[PDB]
Write an enzyme that holds these catalytic residues in place. Structure first.
Site, PDB file in Angstrom:
ATOM      1  N   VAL D  90     -61.267  60.763   7.730  1.00 13.19           N
ATOM      2  CA  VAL D  90     -62.572  60.150   7.905  1.00 13.19           C
ATOM      3  C   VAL D  90     -63.529  60.757   6.888  1.00 13.19           C
ATOM      4  O   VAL D  90     -63.493  61.964   6.650  1.00 13.19           O
ATOM      5  CB  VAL D  90     -63.139  60.428   9.318  1.00 13.19           C
ATOM      6  CG1 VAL D  90     -64.476  59.690   9.518  1.00 13.19           C
ATOM      7  CG2 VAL D  90     -62.119  60.039  10.368  1.00 13.19           C
ATOM      8  N   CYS D  91     -64.394  59.918   6.312  1.00 14.18           N
ATOM      9  CA  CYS D  91     -65.315  60.335   5.286  1.00 14.18           C
ATOM     10  C   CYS D  91     -66.716  60.020   5.689  1.00 14.18           C
ATOM     11  O   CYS D  91     -67.157  58.836   5.637  1.00 14.18           O
ATOM     12  CB  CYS D  91     -64.937  59.671   3.984  1.00 14.18           C
ATOM     13  SG  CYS D  91     -65.175  60.651   2.528  1.00 14.18           S
ATOM     14  N   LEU D  92     -67.449  61.054   6.096  1.00 18.87           N
ATOM     15  CA  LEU D  92     -68.757  60.886   6.734  1.00 18.87           C
ATOM     16  C   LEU D  92     -69.670  62.028   6.319  1.00 18.87           C
ATOM     17  O   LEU D  92     -69.244  63.185   6.314  1.00 18.87           O
ATOM     18  CB  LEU D  92     -68.584  60.861   8.261  1.00 18.87           C
ATOM     19  CG  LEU D  92     -69.828  60.628   9.117  1.00 18.87           C
ATOM     20  CD1 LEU D  92     -70.493  59.319   8.681  1.00 18.87           C
ATOM     21  CD2 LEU D  92     -69.474  60.635  10.635  1.00 18.87           C
TER      22      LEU D  92
END
Lengths: 79, 156, 65, 156
Positions: D90-92
């Site tokens: 996940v890229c947040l």
């Protein structure tokens, strides 16, 4: 112009209760909440009734009440 | 070997100097079951592209040799290839750090040829369409290469 | 007069000190001040799939809780 | 030097007080102790979105530098979503030490954040080609796919 108690409930669990005049715009309370908590008003967002709150908005204009809670959210973006 | 020096330091001259067997020679020399190693080879061949015909047709034939051996391999994942391609052309972010290549002209022109080919899976087309249409500096740098490839891709 | 802070949820010195040490929010340990709180015994033997089963497929509140 | 000590407190806290519908459970070390640096997690899709009804497994991996550095979060298996890498990562921004991460951000907020991200992609910077393409090509088809995925990961 009588007074309401509004709670601001942060994602970190904190709650800050303000006594605010019903005809006072929320930009005042937002600024005081950011000053108290040490955030920037662009670094977060305020929501009542699930709807995003303007600086302009007034508690009566938003049909608020006593003990009505405002929710704060941390800004985030995917990448 | 002869290929190993051309791959390690691509020049348009070293491509011809491999001889007429260069397409097969490079296709043989690469792991065609590895999408990333195919991407690395594809870009190296791509990097030497000139629209002067004897360099052009020689790049096109090495690409066709490389890709047809790759796209018929069962251990070769086409989608992973395209993903790693967009990564290496700096059009898509990755977890790993990758070398930014400045000029996308050759890769674009190579892709433009290869998309026309029958060995090319039509499924990978709209993925490409989406990332070529997507704003990028190096894509704006060669607007004509970009535009040509786009119009090929609409035809697919 | 315009806006005033009447109340803030605040931990004891001890709770805030513990939160501060771990860099957690000040109000983190305030769950221990809940009237439900059992000063619980139990060790954690409970695995992921059991926790998932224990949901019984119900992912949201209906207001009936 | 606070990582294990803090993680232990977060797991204690979670058992008493955690958001409804969510699961956070540390895995086990070979000796039967809890591994506090590796948690198996489950995030419900937001109600009233195409994500509704799905319970999506996420692995959360910490290191010694916690909470100076955020855990890496990996959807298992990987999810269809513009901001999830093909690896499941996940890229947040709040998971990025250099942008929005603060040490005071807890595992709860991380999980609530990953939830918020589900229905609010940033498509300017996709982590994957596949979901970017569909979203940008046909948005209704995009949501259709999301609904299908939610159903597949609906519990039991």
């Amino acid at each position: 112009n009588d007074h309401i108690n509004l709670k601001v409930a942060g994602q970190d669990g904190s709650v800050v209760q303000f006594k605010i005049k019903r005809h006072t715009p929320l930009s005042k309370l937002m600024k005081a909440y950011c000053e108290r908590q040490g955030l920037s008003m662009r670094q977060i967002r305020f929501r009542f009734d699930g709807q995003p709150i303007n600086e302009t908005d007034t508690p009566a204009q938003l049909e608020m009440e006593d003990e009505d809670t405002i929710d704060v959210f941390q800004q985030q973006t995917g990448g | 070997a002869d290929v190993s020096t051309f791959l390690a330091f691509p020049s348009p001259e070293k491509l011809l100097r491999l001889g007429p067997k260069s397409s097969v020679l490079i296709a043989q020399q690469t792991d065609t079951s590895d999408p990333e190693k195919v991407v690395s080879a594809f870009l190296k061949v791509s990097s030497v592209f000139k629209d002067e015909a004897t360099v052009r047709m020689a790049v096109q034939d090495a690409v066709d040799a490389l890709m047809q051996k790759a796209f018929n391999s069962s251990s070769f994942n086409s989608n992973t290839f395209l993903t790693r391609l967009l990564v290496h052309m700096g059009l898509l972010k990755s977890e790993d750090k990758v070398k930014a290549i400045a000029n996308l002209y050759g890769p674009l022109m190579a892709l433009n040829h290869m998309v026309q080919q029958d060995y090319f899976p039509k499924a990978l087309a709209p993925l490409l369409l989406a990332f070529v249409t997507k704003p990028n500096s190096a894509l704006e740098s060669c607007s004509f290469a970009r535009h040509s490839l786009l119009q090929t891709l609409y035809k697919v | 007069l315009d806006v005033l802070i009447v109340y803030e949820l605040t931990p004891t010195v001890e709770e805030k000190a513990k939160a501060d040490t771990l860099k957690l929010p000040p109000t983190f340990f305030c769950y221990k001040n809940r009237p439900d709180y059992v000063s619980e015994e139990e060790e954690d033997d409970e695995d992921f799939e059991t926790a998932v089963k224990k949901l019984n497929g119900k992912l949201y509140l209906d207001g009936s809780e | 030097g606070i990582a294990l000590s803090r993680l232990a407190q977060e797991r204690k806290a979670w058992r008493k007080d955690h958001p409804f519908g969510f699961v956070a459970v540390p895995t086990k070390n070979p000796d039967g102790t809890m591994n506090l640096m590796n948690w198996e997690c489950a995030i419900p899709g937001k109600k009233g979105t195409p994500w509704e009804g799905g319970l999506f497994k996420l692995r959360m991996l910490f290191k010694d530098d916690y909470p100076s550095s955020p855990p890496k979060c990996k959807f298992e298996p990987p999810l269809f979503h513009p901001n999830v890498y093909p690896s499941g990562t996940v890229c947040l921004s709040i998971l990025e030490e250099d942008k929005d991460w603060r040490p005071a951000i807890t595992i709860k907020q991380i999980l609530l954040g990953i939830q918020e991200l589900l229905n609010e992609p940033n498509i300017q910077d996709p982590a994957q080609a596949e979901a970017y393409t569909i979203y940008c090509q046909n948005r209704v088809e995009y949501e259709k796919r999301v609904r299908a995925q939610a159903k597949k990961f609906a519990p039991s």
